[PDB]
């Protein structure tokens with residue numbers, strides 16, 4: 407997926423791997439490497455008016 | 457602010473507030489804002 411990865415302060419428990427949100431969107435993930443909790447946020451977008 | 461002995465102080469605007477609103481209007485807005493929020497239009501800065 408595409409997004410802006412930034413540091414996270416989620417209090418993940420050791421068994422927990424995948425984060426989630428109100429409506430089935432993974433806003434956090436655990437590295438399959440040296441452990442580090444990381445956030446996921448899509449980059450900027452908007453509409454255009456002329 | 458003398459009108460035949462009538463008192464309109466609770467509905468006329470007062471310049472002692474940043475929002476030029478009457479007392480009853482402030483009560484109404486406070487009652488409705490239980491779910492109305494005072495957000496900043498939720499810009500792209502929502503990345504906390």
Ligand SMILES: *[C@@H]1O[C@H](CO)[C@@H](O[C@@H]2O[C@H](CO)[C@@H](O[C@@H]3O[C@H](CO)[C@@H](O)[C@H](O)[C@@H]3O)[C@H](O)[C@H]2NC(C)=O)[C@H](O)[C@H]1NC(C)=O
Nearest residue numbers: 457458459460461462463464465466467468470478479480
């Ligand atoms: C028109 O009506 C308004 C209110 O409906 C009147 O204003 C009210 O005046 C009373 C007494 O002057 C205030 O009571 C006092 O308030 C102070 C606030 O510090 C308190 O320390 C005193 O112990 C006392 O309770 C009342 O607060 C005030 N209301 C408001 C909203 O300011 C006004 O006097 C009326 N017009 C005329 C010409 O009488």
